[model samples]
Target chain A: SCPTPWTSFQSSCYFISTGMQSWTKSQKNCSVMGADLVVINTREEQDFIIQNLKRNSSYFLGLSDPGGRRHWQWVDQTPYNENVTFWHSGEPNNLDERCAIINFRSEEWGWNDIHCHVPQKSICKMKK
Target chain B: SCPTPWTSFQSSCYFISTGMQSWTKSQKNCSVMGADLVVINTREEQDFIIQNLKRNSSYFLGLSDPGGRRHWQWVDQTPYNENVTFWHSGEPNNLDERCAIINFRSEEWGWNDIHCHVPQKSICKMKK
Candidate 1:
């Protein structure tokens, strides 16, 4: 079978698809393949990814708050740098929902906790 | 749209597919979805997975020899425990080719060094 195609950004290669596994499940699934969820280190990178991402698909990125307190953290354990974050205004409502990464078609980016069972299109990240 | 179906094992969920990205690209791609590569911890687990995995496709397992030597490590940083390994007898030839995990249909299993550009079926893992 032909191998799936992937595109590279910075030091990472990404595969963007329409709605993948659940937030937590997708994260662990990527690990089994020796990869992780995308870690957007800069606005340029996030913008670049968003341009390719399927808009309004609610795809999974990397941010998650497993403890459920809304303390979002990257899957790779990189410290959250606010300077690099692109949270939409009035975002991260911190409701009872479990949070995952999301990018809006309106050029806004941030984290939101929808249902965990609902699978959204997701991106996978591997270091090059 | 219906979410991608994922089967779970232990704390991880996996998505098995025919020939995905390269070992490294697949790894990162998995991460972008908030996951990493598979980490086979026991024979029972490995056997259980192989039962579902398609054979002869040269799928990418979590193991890699990035440093150019034959030291195989799981995508996760878990220490290499020989006790849990199921290397085919007289395998791990330690050749010049880059090493990625491969499973054969003959009930034997081990690592092989194939070209990176060659895309092979792969599995992605997520945490449930």
Candidate 2:
């Protein structure tokens, strides 16, 4: 019952893009299909998405600190909840205006914040 | 995010009703909230829903032989594909006009056709 070639997890469907793009471009691509970069809300869901990632691939997540104040938020406007977050240690180090990602290179498979213009594969999500 | 208390999977959200109702009434209850009875299309999804079921409980699925000619169809009008179905052995035996269900008592956790008016829990699904 999900969109063709996309996978369903909890109540949402997800698509992993094969191509790389800036986080902004990737978000646009997902929006074109009435979706947004994946907004993970649970550990089970984070694990599910991680299981689908290639061993060496990193994917953009739908989180960013638009105000440059570490006031991170998902694309859908939900405030980042640190207690439930999966950030890699020392991540979101405020190195630059940043966006979050599921970084495969990290030992814990947790999130990292990187320059927004850097290109990478991305994950998209939509309701079925 | 999905409505509070509704579970997400893949591209759709689902709600398993606590009260019992006939197939038609159950479908109406879902429709009132912009959903339909659950429509399953894969083994993994079937397994997921089954895992959420109570061991002794059965739930109405979104399938029926509505034409009374044994031509089964999902509530969304998709023709039933035998190859992907998980019917219990000897099911849809045509003993009575019937609708389909996830029969928890079955050995394989498969589907069964039962009288349409029988009261039972029902699974509802909707796009997130």
Candidate 3:
């Protein structure tokens, strides 16, 4: 069973943090809770997070390109899959200090690249 | 605030039914709950229902072709817009009795026209 304050969707236990924190700080916070930032592997999961999110509020995603080298990766060991991404139009536009946020764009949620140090809410997930 | 046993998503309160019921009966049940069969107007909502659904289970949608005239409408006077649809490939295959079910096909949810008598679970929604 999923714990209180965490939602269970299929085989995963997920949590949404209301406190704004940096991408690194958010991951650290999640790690302290025996989980890591969420890795969205499907469009269905993408939509789940989108609908649960607050409007006009940005949240840190587990994706980022460290060193500004354009090599994006999911947190930990998950490989990047282009097949199921939800990037907004012209996203990953930042050329420096790259990180990702699932932000509201044009009335919908989509992946947008931003600086890792930017404070935002975060999603945490662990297997059920 | 949304009521217990119902989920809050943005400006709406949504519910899912496990009991299989005809489209007419499902709509009536939702009416008793002060809601109606859900009218999915956005891709995000579509995906939300998709992820929340139990795989291999179909659900009644708010859409159906009245009188089998090929003219579709949402329940309670909402116009059926073709702009946002998720019809399965070559769907609306049945011409004998036209009603819709959100069924899983090819790994995701899409609209499929079937007879109204076919019992299935239903999704319902009301403004939050």
Note the Cα lDDT for every prediction shown: 0.56, 0.68, 0.68
lDDT of 3 at A72: 35
Docking class of 2: incorrect
> Which lDDT tens digits does candidate 2 get at residues A8-110?
8878899999889998899899989888888766667778888888868888877654422233332223344445432223333331345667765435576
**CAPRI quality of model 3:** incorrect
Q: Candidate 1 lDDT, tens digit per residue, A17-126?
A: 55477767776776666677665556677667767765566676565423321233333344434343322244333323343456563525444445556777777778
lDDT for each residue of candidate 2 in B5-114, tens digit (9 for 90 to 100): 78878888889899899988988998898988887766667767776778678888776544221333332233444453322233333323356677644345666656
After superposing candidate 3, which stretches have Cα over 4 Å from the reference?
A: A1-128, B68-97
Q: TM-score of each candidate?
A: 0.36, 0.39, 0.40
Query: Positional deviation of B53 in candidate 2, in angstroms?
Result: 74
Span of 10 residues, lowest total lDDT, candidate 2 chain A? A67-76
**Predicted complex 2: DockQ:** 0.01
Q: What's the lDDT for residue A124 in model 1?
A: 76
TM-score of chain A of each: 0.63, 0.75, 0.75
Candidate no. 2 TM-score: 0.39
